[PDB]
Amino acid sequence: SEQESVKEFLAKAKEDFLKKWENPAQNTAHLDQFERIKTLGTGSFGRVMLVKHMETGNHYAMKILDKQKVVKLKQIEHTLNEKRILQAVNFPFLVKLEFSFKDNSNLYMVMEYVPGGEMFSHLRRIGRFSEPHARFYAAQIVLTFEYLHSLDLIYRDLKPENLLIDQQGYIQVTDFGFAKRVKGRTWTLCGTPEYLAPEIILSKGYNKAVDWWALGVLIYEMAAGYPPFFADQPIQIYEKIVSGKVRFPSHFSSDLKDLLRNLLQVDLTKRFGNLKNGVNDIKNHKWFATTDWIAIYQRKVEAPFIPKFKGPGDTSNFDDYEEEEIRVSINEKCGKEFSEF
């Protein structure tokens, strides 16, 4: 009967998504309404900055993408997907999208500012996570992937660098730049080398299952302190993944080893998450035996770590990047290309 309670939730959930998916939100703000403070990260065609909405006083994090740059690398459909999906979704562990707009040069997504830093930064600092601590994060990624997949969405870029810690010590998934709504197979060669399912590497066409594979790679980086497949150039990392030969740290509990052994399965018809029981095979595993899946959805569990921050607009849990002025050119660039944004 708890299984039926989720079924209902994700049915009402998918009704919401479709109303926003079919009729998406446009030009709900402007560049001049935001005072730009500091850069929080970057990417191939832009950056994310801390900002202040001058009329509400509130802080947000604003992604800024160069329209011309996106076209040069042929990445239009991806950038359009990010916004469409982000504006559509709604979940305790997904960064919100508050505003979006475009001007002559760039695309702009203003998201709720998550001041805790990226998991990545913390994990590198501390070294590695206690399994209980890594169970707390993993379980929020399970629920979120149970959510996304039921809207027929594949995430494709899970890794510590895109998992943000909020003030209550939980996760906001960011970077939906390779998210794609697909029923059936897709064949795009994208992701981060250390998180790619072998099927992707092998140009096979693939599905939701790659997200279960990444969840295992992620948990293993959380608990070991380093990924299961690594080296000094991608091509050497690719060979390790298809080889299908993992090796576990000696501290890893035996339940962790059996979980990972089942998510890091090369054979797609054996991987947890692509089987007849679905996601429940994961939820019902012994490593997750102490996990109250509903306390976690409801955010009533005690986070094993809360990041320190001394007032709003504090950027102290984030690295320092070189700054750059924002040139908005006098002529519209790529208007037709991004006309749905």
Binding site: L73, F120, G177, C190, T192, A224, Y226, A231
Partner: peptide, 20 residues
């Protein structure tokens, strides 16, 4: 150790995506 090899590796820094 394997922790040690990782720490010395080119890939302990934030990792970019690849794409088409």
């Amino acid at each position: 150790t394997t922790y040690a090899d990782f720490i010395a590796s080119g890939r302990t820094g934030r990792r970019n995506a690849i794409h088409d």
